[PDB]
Structures are given as structure tokens and as C-alpha cells.
């Protein structure tokens, strides 16, 4: 459905955050806020990701 690609690595300081690496393709699951979305990675893990760190796929 909706995929984004990581532009930068991200680890996050909150436990709800989904860490990722530049180049990863993530699927967007929910947009509870304008700049922080819930996404799923290629291993099926879920978490919050910062919109500025990704681009549309």
C-alpha cells in the first residue's frame, strides 16, 4: 500500500520508535500525527518513525 524509503539511519530515544537504516523500505500503517507515523519493516517489526527521515517510495 504505502511505502517510504529511509533517507538516513534512525535509532530513536523512545521505546515506541522503530529503528531503521538508510535505504530500508518501510510500510506505513498509521498517521496519528503529521510528522511521526507508525510503520512496519521488512521483518514485520512496528514502531514510530520521523517523517523527515524518509521519502515516498
Amino acid at each position: 500500500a504505502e511505502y517510504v524509503r529511509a533517507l538516513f539511519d534512525f535509532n530513536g530515544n523512545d521505546e515506541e520508535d522503530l529503528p531503521f537504516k538508510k535505504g530500508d523500505i518501510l510500510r506505513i500503517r498509521d498517521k496519528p500525527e503529521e510528522q511521526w507515523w507508525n510503520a512496519e519493516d521488512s521483518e514485520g517489526k512496528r514502531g514510530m518513525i520521523p517523517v523527515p527521515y524518509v521519502e515516498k517510495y
Binding site: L7, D9, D14, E33, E34, Q35, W36, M48, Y53
Partner: peptide, 9 residues
């Protein structure tokens, strides 16, 4: 380095 991390609401 990455862009600014947006604040969480």
C-alpha cells in the same frame, strides 16, 4: 548528519 527530528505531539 540527518535532518531535524520533529517534536512529538
Amino acid at each position: 548528519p540527518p535532518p531535524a527530528l520533529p517534536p512529538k505531539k
